[PDB]
Every structure is written in C-alpha cells, then in structure tokens.
Amino acid sequence: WAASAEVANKPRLVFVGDELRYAQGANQRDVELDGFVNYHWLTSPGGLGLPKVMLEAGINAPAEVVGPDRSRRALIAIRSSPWKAGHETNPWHDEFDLDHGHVRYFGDHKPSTVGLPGETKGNRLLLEAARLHAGTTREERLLAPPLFLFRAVTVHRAGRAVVKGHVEFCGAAIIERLEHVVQRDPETGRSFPNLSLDLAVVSGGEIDGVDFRWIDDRRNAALAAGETLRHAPESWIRWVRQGRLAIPGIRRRVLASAVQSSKEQQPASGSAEAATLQTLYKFYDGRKHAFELLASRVAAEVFRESGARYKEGWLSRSSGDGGVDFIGRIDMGSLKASTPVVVLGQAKCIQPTSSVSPEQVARVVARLRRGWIGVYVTTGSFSRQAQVEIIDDQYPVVLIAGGTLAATVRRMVQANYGGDLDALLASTVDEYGAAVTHRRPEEVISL
Amino acid sequence: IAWAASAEVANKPRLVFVGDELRYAQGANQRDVELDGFVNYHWLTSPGGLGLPKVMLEAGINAPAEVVGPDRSRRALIAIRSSPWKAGHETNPWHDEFDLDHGHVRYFGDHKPSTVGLPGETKGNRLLLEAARLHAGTTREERLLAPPLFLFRAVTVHRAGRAVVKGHVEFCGAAIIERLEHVVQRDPETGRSFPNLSLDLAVVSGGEIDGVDFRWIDDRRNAALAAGETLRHAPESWIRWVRQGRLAIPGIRRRVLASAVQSSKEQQPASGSAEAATLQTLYKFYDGRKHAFELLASRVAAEVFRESGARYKEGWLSRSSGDGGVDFIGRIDMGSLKASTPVVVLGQAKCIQPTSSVSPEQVARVVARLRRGWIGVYVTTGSFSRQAQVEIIDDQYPVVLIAGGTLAATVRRMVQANYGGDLDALLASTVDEYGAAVTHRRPEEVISL
Amino acid sequence: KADIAWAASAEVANKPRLVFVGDELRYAQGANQRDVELDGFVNYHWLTSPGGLGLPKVMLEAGINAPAEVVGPDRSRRALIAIRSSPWKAGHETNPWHDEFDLDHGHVRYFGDHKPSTVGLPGETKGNRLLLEAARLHAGTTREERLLAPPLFLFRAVTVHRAGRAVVKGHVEFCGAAIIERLEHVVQRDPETGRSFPNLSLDLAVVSGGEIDGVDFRWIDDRRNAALAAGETLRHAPESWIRWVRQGRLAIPGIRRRVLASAVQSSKEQQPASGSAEAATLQTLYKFYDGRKHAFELLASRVAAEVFRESGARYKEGWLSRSSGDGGVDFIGRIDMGSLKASTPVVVLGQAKCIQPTSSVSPEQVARVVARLRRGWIGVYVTTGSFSRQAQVEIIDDQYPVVLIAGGTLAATVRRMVQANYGGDLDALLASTVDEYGAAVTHRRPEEVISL
Amino acid sequence: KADIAWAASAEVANKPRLVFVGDELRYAQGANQRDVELDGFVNYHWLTSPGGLGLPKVMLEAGINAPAEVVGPDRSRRALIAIRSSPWKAGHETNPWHDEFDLDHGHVRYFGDHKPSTVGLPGETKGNRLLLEAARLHAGTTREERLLAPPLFLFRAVTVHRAGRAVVKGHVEFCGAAIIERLEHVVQRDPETGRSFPNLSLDLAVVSGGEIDGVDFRWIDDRRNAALAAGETLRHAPESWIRWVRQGRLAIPGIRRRVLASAVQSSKEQQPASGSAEAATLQTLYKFYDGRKHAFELLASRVAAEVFRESGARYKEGWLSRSSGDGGVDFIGRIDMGSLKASTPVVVLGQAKCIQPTSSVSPEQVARVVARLRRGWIGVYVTTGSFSRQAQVEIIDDQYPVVLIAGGTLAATVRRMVQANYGGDLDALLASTVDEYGAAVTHRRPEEVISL
Ligand SMILES: [Mg+2]
Ligand SMILES: [Mg+2]
C-alpha cells in the first residue's frame, strides 16, 4: 500500500545510453548495483508486489495483465547482444540507428528450431505485438505493448573491466513493419526462416528519457488501458491517438553538433558590426566578384586564425556565376610533416535577413573530391535545413555568415588602413579583383 | 654576316623549358630576344641570323616549307598550337587534353564541317598524316626523317599584376605521334557531322633540365645537313626513340611529379645521431608490442597535428587484438572556434625495421578507408617507399606521412617536455596508460565525441 | 556484248563507291540501276546494285529485306540484310515499341515484323525468320561461321530538302552496317486495336567505318559475287567488321560507331514533340502529380527501375524516404553490377520533382542529390520538366554520376509501362502510385539496401 | 464412386500441402501418388499430384515438362511448367552453357532444349515452345493475361545423404516458383561433337514465398482444376505472385527471393571443382600467364568485359594502362548506365594479377585498386587465385565498389568465351592476347574513356 504509493509518486527516468546493471538474482529494492543503476529495480520496484521483468537475450515479456474489462501485454523487453563494430560481419545483425530513431531488429528463430516461424516464444510475442502496432483504431493501439530496447554495452568506470555485466537502454519503440526473412547459418550452411522488424524509436520530448512508471501503470491490473498513459511519452500518446501518420513527427532525432539560428549567425541589432555588415551588403550587392575576392581574404583569415597554414590560390571567374568562386589550400600537419588540402570557396552576397538554402551549399559540397574541404561566405545566414544537411551527412564545409564576415572585415580594417574602413573595400573593388586563373583547383597543390 | 651571324646563332643554345611563357605577336621581329617582359617567339624559333623565314604559330597545325637535304627531303618540324583554354568552361568532346605530367597529349585536327572531302583535305591534317607515317616508322631512317611536333598553348599571363588573355603562348614540349585515329564530330552551331583526325602524342623527357634547345630546329631546317646530322642539339630521349623505336617510348616519355620525393635517407635519422639510437630503442621495444606502438603513434600524430597550432582531438584505438586497416581515430577542427568543421582522421601504426620501407599497397589500405572530408596518417619506424610517395603525390591522396625521423624527433620532444626524463617512462606509459581499447565505435562518431 | 558486259563488270569492280552515314538517297521502286543520281540525290538502286554488275535489285520495302541466297564456291551465303525503318517521326511516335536510333553511340534498337494477326510463335514471319537466321551467324562460334554472317545495312525513311522546300517521301538515309548484338523475346500492344502479340527485340551495334564514316558498296558486290568465297569478300569491308569476324563477341565492345557531340540537351530536346502523344501524357502527369508529391516519388522510383532495366542493368526495388515532408533523397534502389557469379551492389539514390514541363531544374537542385552520393553510389533525377544548361554543364565537367530523366524520357517510359502492364490505362498506374506510396516508405539508411 | 471421390478431393483440398526451397524429394517415375514418403524422403508424385484428386502425374522428365492444358469455364490455361535441372557438377561441368543458380538472390539462368540435331528455328522443340508460349503470358499486358501465366516450378537433381549413405540419382530439390524475367536468343557449342546450334536463354526471377520460404502446392491443384477460373486460383498462391499478377513488370524488382547470408567465400568456393574442366582450364591459364603479365591484363580486360555484359549492360572497351612495368590499375573500361537518352558513363578501373590458384589476394592489394576510385567509378579485380577472407570482409564492411573475379569465375568465363568465339580453341584466345596486348595500350587518363 504505502510502498506501492511511494513507488507511484517517484519518477523513474531512464535515458537513452544509461548503462544499467543486469544480473542474476539481485534485489528489486536497491536503486543502484555495482556502481550502476539496477535494472530489476528500474523495471520492477518490488513495492508493487509484481514479478521481475526478465531481460534475456532476444525478446522478453512478463505475464499478461488481466485488467477489469480487458487483458493486455504490459511491455516487450528486447535485449540485443552483438557489439561488433566491424568485428563480426553478418547481414542478419541488428542495425541500430538511434540518431534517426530507427532500429532493424531480427527474430529469435534459430537454425536448430523445429517449428515454423514464429512458433518460438519471441517471434510469437513479436507477431502478437505487431498485430496491435498496426492497428487502425485507437483501442487496438492502446493495447499495443511498447518495445523497450536494451543492448550489451561496454563501460569502464574505474578504467577496467568494461566488457560484460551491463545493459544499455536504447528507448521505447513502435513496430512499423514486420517481415519474414530467410537466413543461412554460416556454420552449417543451413537456410532457415526468421522474422525481422522495422522499429521506430519515439522521442522523449522534453527530455531524452522515459519514465518507467509507465510500465508500472501498464502492469497494473486495476487500471484499464486508457488510464495507463499518464507517464507515457507525449509522442507515444500521439501515436495512440493519430496512428501511423503521426510517426514521422514523433520519431526521435539527434544531431551530432549544435545548430545556430539566424540570430546567432547575425551580429547584434544595434552594434557597429551590424552597420558594418549593412555597409558591406550595400557595397557588394552589385559587386559580386569583388565580394568573392573579399570572401577569399576572409576565408584565408578564418583558416589562419585556427592555426592552419592557408594558401590563397586564385579566383575562378570574372563572369558567369559558377559553383566555385575562389580556391585555397591548407597544409594540414607540422612543418615538413604535412599534407595538402584543396579548399573550394563560394561567395554569396544576399540581404542579411535572407538565408542560404541547403542546395546552394550542396552546390559547393558536390565539387569536393577526397582530401578537399569547402568554405561558404555570406552576408546573410544559413537555413536550418542547410546546417542539418551538413551536420547529419558530415559535409566538410566551413560556414562564414554575416557575423563572422563582419568581424573579420572589421579586424582587417584595423589591420591595414589609414584610419578609415574603406581601405579593404577599395582594395577589393579596384586593382587585384580583375585577375583570374584558368587552372584546375587541385593544381593549387603545385603552387 | 651571311656566316658570322649564322655562326653566332649556331654557337648559342636556346633552351626552352616546359611552362615557359612566350610572346607571340602578329608581324613580330626575329631579332628581338625579350618582348614585353616575355621571350619573343619568332626570335626563339628563328633567330634571324640564319636568314630563314620565321616559323609561324597560328592557332592549330603549322609547318615551314620542306627542307630538301643533300640526299633526302624532310619536314623540319610541325608547330602545334592548341586553340581553346579558359578553366573549362570549354565543354566539348573534341577538346584537346593536356596531361604533361605523364607526357600525354590528345590533340584534335583542323578538319571543318564545311570542309569538302575526307581527312586530311585540309593542309594541317595532311601534315598530320604525312608526319604520322614517319612517326610509325619501323626503320631508323623513317624515324630519322620524322618531324618533331612542338606544342604550344594559349595562356593567360600576368605581367606586373595585370591579366592578359591573348598575345601569349606556352611551350609544352616536343612530342611523338604514338597514335592516329579517325573520329566523327558534331558541330553545335552546324548540327552536321564531319570527319576529323585524333592524335595520341607522347611528350618526350628533356632530362633533368626539362627543356629543348631550339638549335635542333635550326639543324633540321638546314638544307646542307642530312637527317643523320641534325641530332646534336636534340634531347637524348628523342635520339633514343629514333635509334630504338616504339619500345623506347614508355621509358623516354615525360614524367613530372607535383612535389618532391624524400629518399629513405631523408626520412631516417642521421647516422650517429641521438634520434637514431632513439629510433633503434623504439623499434627494439615495439617489435613485440603492436598495440602499444599504436597508442604511441596516436600520441605522436596528435602532437604533430598540434604543432602547427591546428585544433586536434584524440579519440580511441580500433582493436586491442587482431589485424585491420585502421588503428586509431582522431579529429581536426577546421575553421574558427565554435563554428569550425570536424575532419575525421584515420591513423595506422606499423612498427617495422628502420631500414625497411612501407609499400604503396599497405598505404592504400588506409587511403581506401577515407570518405569525403576525411584524412589519414601513417606512422612507422621505417620509411615510405618511393612508389608509395609517387602514388600519394600523383593520385592526390590526403595522407600525412610520419616516418622514422619524424617519429624519433617528436618522441624525443615528447619525452623532453611531458615526461621530463628518459624514454623509459613514456614507453611504460604506452603500455599502462592505454594501448588497450576493444571499443565498438564508428569513425564518424568522433564528430560528437 | 560479252566484252561490254565483262569490261563493265570489271569497271564497277575497280571503282569504289563510298556511302557515308547520313547520306540522303533517292528510293524509287521502279528506278533503274544505271543513273548514279536521281531527283537531285544518289539513286539507291545504282548504289546497291549498279547496272554494270548485271545483278538483280536489292529491294528495300518496308521492314526487313534480303536478296536471294548466293551459292559460293566454298558454301552458300546470305549477302546482306537491308532494313528500312519508319517513321521515327521526330518524337511524335504513338507506338511505344518504335525503332530507337542512337547513331552517336552506334546502337540501334530494332523490332521485328511480327504482327497482331500473326498466328504462331516468332519468327513465323519472313522478317523475323531472316533475323533469326542472321542471329545464328552474328553469334557464330568460329571465324568461319562469322564469315557467312550477313551485314545489317540500316536505312530510315527521312525528309530531305530540295530547292529550299521539304520533301517528305521518296528518300532513305543510310545509318551504317550493324551487328546483331542481342536478340530477345518481347510482348507488344497495339494502342489502336488493343491487341497484344509476341515479337523480337534486337540490340544492334553499328560498326565504326574506320578511315571513313561509311562503307564501300563493293563489299556487298563481293558478298553477292558467286565467284568469290565468303572469305574472299572482306577486301572492301570495314576494318571493324574484319576484326569482328576474327574475334567475335570480344570485338563488339570496341567496334561501335562513335560521334563526339555535345552532351548538353536543350529544354526542347528533353521535352517530347509539340502535339505528340507523349506530350499529352506528360501534361496529364504534371496536372495529376501537381499536388501529389510522394505518389510522384513512387512513380519516379518505378520509372527509374524501368529505365535501368532497359539498359540490361539488374535493378532491385528499395523504398521511399517518407510519406510526408521533403528531403534531398526521395527514394532508394540498388543495381547489381557484374554477372550472376561475380557482382557488386551499387546504391541508387533517387530524387523526384514535379514542376511545370516548361520549367527547368537548377544546378543546385541536382547538386543536392549529387552531394549525398558516395563512391559506389549513383543518382537519378526524375522530373516532368527539363534540366538547365548550367546543371548539365556542371554534371559533365565535374563528372557527376547521376542519371537524368526529364519530361520526354518520363513520358515515353510511363507510356511503355502502361501499355505493357495495364492495357494502356494510365489511371491504373497513377491510382496505384496514389494508393501504394505510403506503404513503400521505410526509415532505413540507403546502405541497408545492400541487405535486400 | 462419386461421393468417395468428392470426399477424397475435399480432404486433399482441405489440408495445406507445403514445400520449401531446398527440400529434397524422392523422384521415382514409376512410383505411386498415394504414399506420402518414399525411401526416406517426401514422395514427389504425392506432393505434386496426390491420389485423392484423381489427377494424372505431373511428370518430371529431364528438361521442360508441362501437364495438359486446363479448360476452365473462362479460358483455357497451362497448369504449370515443371523444370528439372539435371547436371550435378559442383563445378565439374563440361558444358559452358549449363543452368546457373543464384537462389540467394532469386535469380536463375536457364537454357532451352534445342539440340544440334534439331532442324528449324527456336523453338521447334516442345520445351522451347512451352517456354515461349509461357513467356507470352509472363509478359502479359493485362492482369487477365498474367492470370493465365503458368508458374515455372524449378527442380534441381541433387545428390542426397541419408545417415551416411550418399545417393547420386533419384532425388530432386525444389528451387522455387519463377517468373520469366527475360528470354533471348543464344548460340551454343557442344564440346563433345563440336557442333554449334541456336537455343533460348532465360533469366528467371524466383519469387519470395513471404510467410513461408516455399509454396503451398494447393495453388497448382487449383490451377489444375477445370471447375475454377484463372482468377479463382490465387487463394493459395504466394502474395508476391498475386502482386505480380496485379502490377506486372513493375513487381519483378521487388518480389525476388532473398536469403540473408555472408558474401564471404572461402578459397574453395572461389576455386573451381577439383576434377572440373574449369580446374584444368585455370591450370592452363596459370601455366601460360605465369610469365605473361600484360597479356593476362588484356585477357582480364576481355573477361571483365564479358562479365559486365551478361546482364546486358552497355560495357565500352577502354584500354590497357601499361605495356611494361607495374601499377595500381591495369586496364580501363566504361559502363553507360540506365538512361539511354542522356546516358551516364561509369569509369571502370581494372586490375589483373596472376598468382598461384591456391594462393589468395590480400586486402592491401585490393585497396590499392579501390583507392584510385572516384565517385561514380567502379573497380574490378581479376586473378587466377582467390581473395583472402580479410580482403572480402574489408570490401563488405567498407562497401568497396569492386567486382571480384577469382579462379573459378575466370576459368568458367574464359571457357565460355573460347567455346563461343574460337571453336573451343583456348590457344586462339591466349595467342590473341599475346599478339594484341601491346597495341591495346594507351597513355590516357581513365576519365578520357568517356570520349569513347
Ligand atoms: Mg598496423
Ligand atoms: Mg523530390
């Protein structure tokens, strides 16, 4: 009573990546075990008076919960074992892509299995669940058991014994596709049928975790299915209510690096850098090529500020647009211990309140050979989709928006001038800017 | 001065190197040496002290009159001038292809869509057939009578900082016609198909000088000289071709690397030096400690990339046991702070004998792992073979080479600064601190490490 | 009489008469074999069978033609097969199985003479029987068998110009000599009568002429010469054909006719003809998928699959990226490059954009798909409109491995698919795409297409 | 006898009678149709035609079989086509044009029953007629036509083992139900009598069974029942087949059978059989090219050309990189993929290396060729030996776009080329490579192959 109420009042958030302590026996009451969060306490507090949620290799599920009106499966605890990363090669291996909220899972049908798929407990559970996850009604999706994902992880807290003794939470998942597959046992050369699952890992919403009180609610026989969504992710509830169509929006999405919006890419509102940026925009609006020269100078300064040895090559054109405007070179490495890196640059003078589309960046990325990097210089900013495209696809492109451009221009004004700011602008417009070289980019290595 | 001037011309070599920008003007003098900050073409090809007509260089195929020697009649030379060039920006399937580093030039003839008949109904293509008939000679006499093809290209130059598109050419060498074929082209403005000639040309090597003496032309234009007496000022490669034939071509063609190649001596520590004994101790130690040397290589490479002031980020080791293509993984932050772009680095370690070298294959094993925006680093106690470096320079591989010398030097620096003592500690540190990492991580993942 | 005919024959035999690819010849079924020129153009019957040779005419009726078999000293042989194709019709064809001429790359797709009313298996018809009998020798297992193989002289009824006017009928254009590179079974449908029927589809390789862009008709004179053995008929033959006779199928990948032309197509070229059926088809496709993005993505995946299989490439159906929203890649597929025992999987990244047929696709838009490509990956861009000149230029220059499918190609492909699968009902295909695009969506990585 | 037959037939049609791909069946032509098991295996005649139906046997004579045409209430239809592939060579086949099985990717290459003693065009013989008449329906232009299409049930004679007892004959292996994906003309040579003859070549797509890796044989029972229309026989058919009946050609690239297995082949799987003719061929090739590097390079270019053209892909002959010395790339080729209107070329980088057949190729050697590959380029590696396990797993894990040609594939390919072009004379090909390797060399960049 008081213990179960104590349980129902304390959130048990488990985040994606948390290394849980899984062990034979142990205690459902101890919150932490062997320096790690105890799995058995996390899934079954013990104050509920409920059996443990077993997490064996493959598919797991506790006994069915007989509610007052209807019965249901509480959850499905799936544990994946292999952590190959190139060590073990197999097309039937579980494929985890949690950053895009997608997991390719495989059934528990074995080469030595006598029955037809899936008469195995795991695949039977997976079929039962899949029938509910594909439900076209809210009532069928309400009964649909979530797929809690776990994997064998490696972790050395004291700097030793990282292997084994751990499991890692990988999120809650919806079955979006079930397929029958055929596999061949590489040991015996035997072809056996199996099941395979497309899993969509839902978003945690505000946080990247899941409250395991949801499981407690689903294991509560006094509660109907409709009253078990209090602590469930808003994404999951949205799937229960809207269905498959709600999946593309509720799917988990993780980016490696941070994305900066327009305000972060632009200098402050009433700053001198803002006025400077506006003067630059008013100057190079009708002057494209001089702005490309200025862009070459700016990019040069940017790469030289990072400590990299930069070499300005040439400007590609004096007319007719093009995807590449200027060429540079970066000798990455120590003195007499370096390698040449061809740098492809692109200048785009646009209104500081306007933005650069991902295809415009891709026009620069597409040129990049192996050992080449890109650089984009603009008076405006870059769209969110451009940054997402660059980060998620790992495009080797350095971004130089209105803020960095303004700062570099001001600094260069302070560098060489007579007390004015039109020194750099005049240096860009007149003289040098007319010269162009009709040579291949890679040839920048030779100069 | 019918002899004295010609003698003064005959005793002065005119070395023209590949890449030399020459001044070509209409109605240019043959006496003026330097013109408008560049060498005058007409004086170069015809000094004027000879009293001979100048060798014209119009856009396309050019050739002076036949030189009737004492026994045989011969064509002195065929001056070729490639027509278009502008960064390319020259999109058309019949464009001349210049690959001077490998001594190869694909040249297209001057047959026009309005030209009636077949190639070579034009003078130039006729000269091409006439020449190629001798360039494919089976005898020494035929190859002796064969006229050299001097190649020139329209080039945009910069005298005193101002760009000049026209009025200048660029010497590309003397080539041998190694192939002639017939092609069919379609003119965009005409839409009609017309036949044409196609030449695969092999630009000969000028030796270490990489140039030719234009007195050779003077000898070939000399009617008093037989064909056998005109090879004094010719490059040894061409003479080798005339004497040997087709079998000489693959060895006498021009071969120029984009950058220099370090010898094994250059990559290895000097004899009797401290870093020599240091490298010896390193090899002696890591001969049985592979993973430890992998860790050491990671640290060394990290220090190397750190030395330039560049932003480097160490990662992890691939395998603590077994064999593979990559050993360690790092990252290089390219660009300003908090706005840079991550560059994944793949590092390979290989502790071999300091005298032994690393083959192009095992380097390519690391090169073939590099995606776009990724670079590599190879650390060894030995050197990198000449051919490996050749394939790194020529094929444009993004790989930092750290041989025995760089390894020894960087190691001594490391032990001087970080460990403040002898190498021993550091060595122990390469076994105790790490060297063991049975990790399960993807190379790209380091971007968010 | 005897001396006259003999000296005339010897005169014809000793004088070369070169016909070049694209030569406009006057064809009259009643024309004689004496005049070297007729109605301002070269007389066909003189060029193929001069009067001084004393031989019957080489008739060039509609379709497949062949003179009576010549009994040589060594053995009997078929001199040649003369093919007259029509109309091609400047992109205004209504039959999806019309002859496809690509003389710039030395390939011609030619369909047999099997008709909807033909009873029995192909080739019961004359033409197909000749094509099979020729196919036996164009794939001869020895040089001796290939010596007997009758050259396929291609001709097509074209419109010429005389005195500033246009003459539509009465002239044929020479398209070179061809080798039967492939001969396969096909099923066609008559769009007017609604009948379906088997037929033979042939991949023909137009041989390079060598020193000239054409052939000497004395080759045929020798092949038609009963006094000459088959091995004695190669004295006026192209070097490429001699090389093929010697080597066989090994020579074919290197003896095809090649014309160096601009690979940049105008907007008009990428689009179908003005009043063509493919134009109306394209208009229907644009008006339908104007508000149906992902259905057009599915259609584009199927069309891409068809286009790839058309080149013999073994394409594997992958999936669609999403059922809502937008992105760089719209669909994923896979091609197995190589053979059955030896092959490597190349991942196909697809992109579909339904814009106005008159509108154009920018270089940025194609670069967005190209940038996603890794080594071992290829791309494909399907659109109802055209690709801009700058886009194509940047593709050619920087060597972008992307297959372009514009309005004309899309319309033709879709028409072929519909005629060959749904009884010529476009609505079946369109409704299929509308109803099945959601279930064609997975959130898998492109690489995972290898596991299919 | 009516009530008994009704009850029997009903009892048969009530029970699902399944057969999976790989299942071994005892075939005795003189056996009965009542016993479920025969000599320790499932009785073929019971599975294909149970006695409860009172229907005749579906005989499986060597080659192409088919029962009598079923006259339904709607139309007349062929029940099925039962195909028996006889030779059990494991590589030791003496016939270059033997049936190829790639069941892991649902692809089977099958050859017709045209013989040297056969007089007439393909297919005057019964089997080829059945295949042509079937292909007419497999490429049916409507769902109604595809409804009538008889499924090709594949059977392969495989030596079985029963607890220590290997039996060579009397057993067939079910290899699935196939759709005729392609049917073309082929010319073959008989290595025993030395006679050449035309024949039919078939590319077959083995469909996925879906829920089961096989078929329910009640499907055929319904296809044999005259009381049923063609649209009433899909109740027990595989879902992939129903999808093909609906969609047609569009369904093919997405219904093929797929077995998830390791592509890593051992040295035995890469090498020909021990007593094979391919082994002798490979030994001859090794003993010949042990000191002839560049001739082997030319041979490898030709072999790669042959491999890339099997599917029908447009492979262009390029050139050899060197006449002397050694380099990373030995030859260059080109593959124009898909479009055919605005064709995209794919640069092929080739590497040849003649080593001992018992030796293998290291991952470094492969990566030396792979490193040279740009975007939209593919590699090909030809060797007399094999490829090491580490090389294979390194190609797989990193997705290297390189086609591997080991000793087995090389020997088979060369043998087929020789039999199909040089009258079975290997020396003609070898000496051709010796004579022509020097002139096949240019010094052009690989990219220049685009201008070919
Ligand atoms: Mg190593
Ligand atoms: Mg799209």
Ligand SMILES: [Mg+2]
């Ligand atoms: Mg080799």
